[PDB]
Design a binder for this molecule. Structure first.
Ligand SMILES: O=S(=O)(O)CCN1CCN(CCS(=O)(=O)O)CC1
Ligand SMILES: [Mg+2]
Length: 291
């Protein structure tokens, strides 16, 4: 039987849970299925990576490029201005999520377009990532390590920049075979210089679309009917829409900011909400019982 009361990781004050009995029953199902039924579906930015260090916000994959030696101060000025106008739409309490779709498409297209003008070479990405301020959440080596040890599928589904994300995990030593990355990947010209992005855009609000356009992945994993989902946004709740069959799904949400405004809604939609939390110890504690 599962008792969150007896799990020290769940006693941390950042752990917020509306329905602990329900959560205990989901984790109970996860444990019963063991490795053979488990898969992970996860966002990256601010979910696997830290939201902040020392009251200095940490970079998203996109910020890593925004901030690198290859990008001019004037470019960052424009990027900032984009962010200020479009982020106000993102968080607008009056617009429906569907109304925000076109605005999100513009923001990501305009900001990608400014990066494309700056001339980013594939060969520089290693240096850029090494020099950046990126940080993975505390407990990431045990997270990725237990999962790879047991061959648990991990589907990292990111509205960031795929090439940057992959380079971060590769340098961390955690880009193992069990880890599949679906993101916005760079398109490179004859000289290995960024010229655009591949595929259809993934942004914060359309992850349902991408989840459905990955049937190949999920149909191979028909038996993995127990899911752990990790996200930092309401949008990440859709990352599991492509899953073949679902027996148990546990949804863990990082609430990194706009805490007072969003806490109720997060507690309502995620099973476990982690408030201003920079570790993976709750999820690692669940893996520990399960694997
Ligand atoms: O599922 S299997 O039977 O194949 C493996 C069993 N697995 C072994 C490790 N224990 C740790 C006990 S606990 O400390 O996590 O409770 C959890 C379950
Ligand atoms: Mg994110």
């Amino acid at each position: 039987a599962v008792h969150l009361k007896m799990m020290p990781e769940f006693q941390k004050s950042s752990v917020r849970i509306k329905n602990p009995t329900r959560v205990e029953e989901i984790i109970c199902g996860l444990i019963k299925g063991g490795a053979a039924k488990l898969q992970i579906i996860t966002d990256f930015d601010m979910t696997l990576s830290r939201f902040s260090y020392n009251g200095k916000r940490c970079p998203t994959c996109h910020n890593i490029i925004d901030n690198c030696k290859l990008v001019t101060d004037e470019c960052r000025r424009k990027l900032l201005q984009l962010k200020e106008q479009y982020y106000a739409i993102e968080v607008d309490p009056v617009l429906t999520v569907e109304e925000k779709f076109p605005y999100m498409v513009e923001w990501y297209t305009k900001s990608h377009g400014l990066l494309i003008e700056q001339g980013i070479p594939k060969a520089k990405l290693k240096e850029i990532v090494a020099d950046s301020d990126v940080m993975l959440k505390e407990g990431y080596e045990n997270f990725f390590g237990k999962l790879q040890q047991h061959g648990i599928p991990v589907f990292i589904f990111s509205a960031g920049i795929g090439d940057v994300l992959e380079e971060v995990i590769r340098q961390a030593g955690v880009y193992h075979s069990n880890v599949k990355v679906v993101s916005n990947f760079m398109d490179f010209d004859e000289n290995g210089v960024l010229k655009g992005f591949k595929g259809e855009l993934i942004h914060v609000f359309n992850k349902h679309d991408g989840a459905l356009k990955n049937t190949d992945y999920f149909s191979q994993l028909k038996d993995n009917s127990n899911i752990i989902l990790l996200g930092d946004s309401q949008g990440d709740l859709r990352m599991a829409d492509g899953v073949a069959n679902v027996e148990h799904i546990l949804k863990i949400g990082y609430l990194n900011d706009r805490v007072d405004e969003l806490l109720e809604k997060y507690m309502d939609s995620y099973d476990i909400v982690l408030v201003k939390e920079e570790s993976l110890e709750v999820v690692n504690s669940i893996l520990q019982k399960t694997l």
